[PDB]
From a paper:
In an attempt to determine the location of the pyocin L1 d-rhamnose binding site(s) and the structural basis of the d-rhamnose specificity of pyocin L1 we determined the X-ray structures of pyocin L1 with bound d-mannose, d-rhamnose and in the unbound form. The strands contain a tryptophan residue which forms π-stacking interactions with two other tryptophans in the β-prism to stabilise the structure. This interaction is conserved throughout MMBLs, with most members of the class utilising it to form either homo- or hetero-dimers of single MMBL subunits. However, in pyocin L1, as with the recently described structure of putidacin L1, both domains are from a single polypeptide chain. Other structural elements are also common between the two bacteriocins, namely a C-terminal extension of 30 amino acids and a two-turn α-helix insertion into loop 6 of the N-terminal MMBL domain. The overall root mean square deviation (rmsd) of backbone atoms for pyocin L1 and putidacin L1 is 7.5 Å, which is relatively high due to a difference in the relative orientation of the two MMBL domains. Comparison of the respective N- and C- terminal domains from pyocin L1 and putidacin L1 shows they possess very similar folds with rmsds of 2.77 Å and 2.02 Å, respectively. The higher value for comparison of the N-terminal domains is due to the presence of a 2-strand extension to β-sheet two of the putidacin L1 N-terminal MMBL domain, which is absent from pyocin L1 and other MMBLs. MMBL dimers of plant origin often form higher order structures, however small angle X-ray scattering of pyocin L1 showed it to be monomeric in solution.
Alignment of the pyocin L1 protein sequence with other lectin-like bacteriocins, LlpA1Pf-5, LlpAPss642, putidacin L1 (LlpABW), LlpAAu1504 from Burkholderia cenocepacia and LlpAXcm761 from Xanthomonas citri pv. malvacearum shows that pyocin L1 contains tandem MMBL domains with three conserved QxDxNxVxY MMBL sugar-binding motifs. In this work we have shown that pyocin L1 targets susceptible cells through binding to the CPA component of LPS and that primary recognition of CPA occurs through binding of d-rhamnose at the conserved QxDxNxVxY sugar binding motifs of the C-terminal lectin domain.
Author numbering: 2 to 255
Write the structure that this text describes.
């Protein structure tokens, strides 16, 4: 995996790896968070805080010592840091060795929440996905299906119950677009869309609570670039089977 999920902890030799295999970010047993190139050359570090330490992804990436104090932080410069951002923000380590923290607000959803859902897990449907009748996703006790008949439906599985549906009868594809919109088409006729065309690539979140949301990447900070006041345009990255977050790549500068 090249990424860290909200609230994930790494410690005692656990690491992530860039998609090309060249860069490794490892939270060592001696308490140093170190970025390696080619498995042999350290190119950046926190410097060690000793045994018993860990790194956690919690809006910021924070290194904790054994006493439970924060000893190093990304220190993302932010107007507001609410507690639920800690449940949303994720990190990517990309192919030039930079690593970046994203925190993305729901642009559209199948339901309007009265408060954040605690401990929810999202199955990510990435940019460029083209759903075709017969496509399905399973997260927990819920199933997202783009059906033979063109309907996009969320079912509770056991027992089987319709939770939400588009009623896009006849449709033949549903496309998570580069422009930020999610659109259900018969041929090239648009039958339904999320109204989220902004020019920033879309992805969807399908939850293990039977909900679907669309979000767009919002890069706030990188190790090499610092804090960014406006989010640059990124492009979909190469995910592998252990990645559970969106994966992106970003250019070296403007
Ligand atoms: Cl360094
Ligand atoms: Cl996860």
């Amino acid at each position: 995996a090249s990424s860290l999920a909200p609230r994930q902890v790494i410690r005692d030799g656990q690491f992530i790896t860039s998609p090309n295999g060249k860069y490794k970010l490892v939270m060592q047993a001696d308490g140093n968070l170190v970025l390696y190139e080619d498995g042999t050359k350290p190119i950046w570090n926190t410097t060690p805080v000793g045994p018993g330490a860990k790194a956690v992804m919690e809006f910021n990436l924070n290194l904790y010592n054994k006493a439970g104090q924060v000893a190093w932080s990304s220190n993302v410069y932010t107007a507001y840091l609410f507690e639920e951002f800690k449940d949303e923000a994720y990190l990517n380590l990309q192919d030039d060795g930079d690593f970046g923290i994203f925190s993305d607000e729901a642009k559209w959803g199948s339901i309007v929440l009265s408060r954040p859902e605690v401990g929810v897990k999202n199955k990510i449907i990435p940019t460029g996905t083209v759903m075709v009748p017969g496509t399905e996703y399973i997260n927990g006790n819920y199933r997202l299906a783009f059906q033979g008949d063109g309907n996009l439906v969320i079912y509770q599985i056991n027992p089987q119950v319709v939770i939400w549906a588009t009623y896009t009868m006849g449709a033949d594809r549903a496309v998570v677009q580069e422009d930020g919109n999610f659109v259900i088409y018969k041929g090239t006729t648009a039958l339904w869309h999320t109204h989220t065309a902004t020019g920033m690539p879309a992805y969807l979140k399908f939850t293990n609570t039977g909900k679907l949301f669309l979000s767009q990447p919002t890069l706030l900070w990188t190790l090499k670039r610092g804090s960014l006041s406006k989010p640059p345009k990124v492009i979909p990255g190469q995910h592998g089977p252990l990645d559970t977050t969106p994966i992106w790549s970003w250019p070296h500068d403007y």
